[PDB]
Design a protein around this ligand. Structure first.
Ligand SMILES: Cc1cc2nc3c(=O)[nH]c(=O)nc-3n(C[C@H](O)[C@H](O)[C@H](O)COP(=O)(O)OP(=O)(O)OC[C@H]3O[C@@H](n4cnc5c(N)ncnc54)[C@H](O)[C@@H]3O)c2cc1C
Ligand SMILES: [Cl-]
Length: 476
């Protein structure tokens, strides 16, 4: 037997977040290496795992790792990064930084991946994951003409790569803010909860990339907030037994006469509903507040969206008989008595969500300088832009914010100059909405950090550094 061979293989097969870390520390032990020690650790790992079950992955990884851009991992060799949040994008950012050769510390306030909700995928993201060795880390990946990963399956897959490329990950730790460098001869340090491990508290860094999801407002940035008429969104996951007759029900994605025939037997009033068949029978529907008060899923009509959706106002029981009512008729009962999958809490996976307010940051980047040290702050993903989930551009643009944040760190580690690096980034960010698979570079395969492999007719000078004068924060 060969502990190293065995540990790598359960590590790859791992379906629990606490088991990715477990088997990995074991592989590190077996290969006489450490985790969170960068590419020198990655290089020591791969060389000693020169065997059938691993070699195709190193080719894939190194092929990317040696794309013209990363300078064979020498570009950001003098850059210390802090990445906040281990959602899909944050991890993608870490991967990108790891490859650029930056020191990568990722902090994350949870301790597991418990979200089942299925995410639609763009042709280009599908391929990106494939090139990162998704097919080894995940069996049922974009399986068939299917183009959807589940949140946790994505996170697991990405985490395994983050670890391989030597990202230092700390769990159960909350980013709160920043410690200003107290003197002429210090650097920027984070502010973490609950009390972080010795080194992490003293870990200094010039690049902070926060991918801490929609709800986190990072100090200094201005968030624009558009509100329209209310849209309540229900999501539901039912267990996929994958029985022959259970896997013979087509996927779905008020206009058609179906949304009309839904009111007949069930009396459920929905404008649109979506079905995905993944690890779970995924359903997402947009409900009318008019009928949610009627069939008593919401207890009482509160005029302010936020309050109308609290744990108190939402009846959990009726939400299940509402969700299964829509799900049962939607498949014409071809899936039988559907049982919910659980959280997170043993609670059944069903949630009433908000679709009313779309948060967008005014700038995607900000630089802070105090007593000599420069700090580059970048947003990536949901905290940069809040996506209309029915359209499904979240993973697409998060991954884009990630690529365009890594390009920023590249120019940064060339000393390009605060006002400039921002102007490049902000010229690219001005595109982040327009972006569709329709208006972007056709050769998906050729996609890389160089933003012009992605954006046709790109203008790096759409914003002059004189238009961003106050995104640079000279505190003295
Ligand atoms: C039900 C649902 C359906 C969706 N539909 C689609 C779809 O069909 N297609 C599509 O492409 N996208 C879809 N979206 C959007 C997509 O899920 C998100 O945009 C995506 O998760 C973005 O990843 P993220 O890392 O930016 O955000 P998140 O996944 O929310 O990552 C944030 C993470 O950072 C952590 N965090 C927050 N604050 C701190 C802190 N202070 N310190 C440390 N960690 C912190 C949290 O633990 C969290 O894990 C959907 C989303 C949901 C929820
Ligand atoms: Cl987990």
């Amino acid at each position: 037997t060969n502990p190293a061979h065995d540990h790598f293989e359960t590590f790859v097969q791992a379906q629990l977040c606490q088991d990715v870390l477990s088997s990995f520390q074991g592989l590190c032990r077996a290969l006489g290496v450490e985790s969170g020690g960068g590419l020198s650790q990655y290089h020591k790992i791969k060389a000693q795992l020169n065997y059938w079950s691993a070699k195709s992955l190193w080719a894939k990884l190194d092929k990317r790792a040696s794309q013209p851009v990363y300078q064979q991992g020498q570009a950001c060799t003098n850059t210390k990064c802090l990445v906040v949040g281990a959602g899909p994008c944050g991890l993608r950012a870490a991967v990108e930084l790891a490859l650029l050769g930056a020191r990568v510390v990722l902090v994350e306030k949870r301790i597991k991946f418990s979200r089942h909700n299925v995410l639609h995928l763009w042709p280009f993201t599908i391929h990106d994951l494939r090139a990162l060795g998704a097919k080894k880390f995940y069996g049922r990946f974009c399986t068939g003409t299917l183009d959807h990963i589940s949140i946790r399956q994505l996170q697991l897959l990405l985490l395994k790569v983050a670890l391989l490329l030597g990202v230092e990950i700390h769990w159960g730790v909350k980013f709160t803010g920043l410690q200003p460098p107290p003197r002429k001869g210090s650097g920027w340090r984070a502010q973490l909860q609950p009390n972080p491990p010795a080194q992490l508290a003293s870990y200094e860094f010039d690049v902070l990339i926060s991918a801490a999801g929609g709800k986190f407002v990072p100090e200094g940035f201005t968030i624009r907030e558009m509100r329209g008429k209310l849209a309540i969104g229900i999501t539901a996951n039912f267990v996929n037994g994958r029985t022959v007759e259970e896997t013979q029900v087509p996927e779905i994605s008020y206009n058609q006469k179906f949304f009309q025939s839904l009111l007949k037997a069930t009396g459920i009033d929905l404008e649109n509903i979506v079905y995905y068949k993944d690890e779970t029978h995924y359903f997402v529907m947009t409900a009318k507040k008019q009928c949610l008060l009627r069939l008593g899923v919401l207890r009482q009509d509160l005029s302010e969206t936020d309050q109308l959706l609290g744990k108190a106002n939402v009846v959990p029981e009726a939400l299940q008989r509402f969700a299964r009512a829509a799900a049962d008729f939607a498949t014409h009962g071809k899936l039988g008595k559907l049982e919910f999958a659980q959280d997170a809490r043993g609670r059944p996976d069903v949630a009433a969500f908000d679709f009313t307010s779309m948060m967008r940051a005014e700038s995607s980047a900000r630089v802070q300088e105090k007593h000599g040290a420069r700090l580059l702050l970048g947003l990536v993903g949901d905290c940069l832009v809040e996506p209309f989930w029915p359209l499904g551009t979240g993973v697409a643009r998060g991954f884009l914010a990630a690529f365009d944040a890594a390009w920023m760190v590249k120019r940064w580690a060339e000393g390009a100059g605060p006002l400039e690096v921002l102007a490049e980034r902000e010229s690219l960010y001005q595109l982040l909405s327009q972006t569709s698979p329709e208006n972007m570079h056709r050769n998906v395969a050729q996609y890389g950090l160089d933003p012009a492999t992605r954006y046709p007719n790109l203008n790096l000078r759409a914003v002059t550094p004189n238009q961003v004068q106050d995104l640079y924060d000279m505190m003295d």
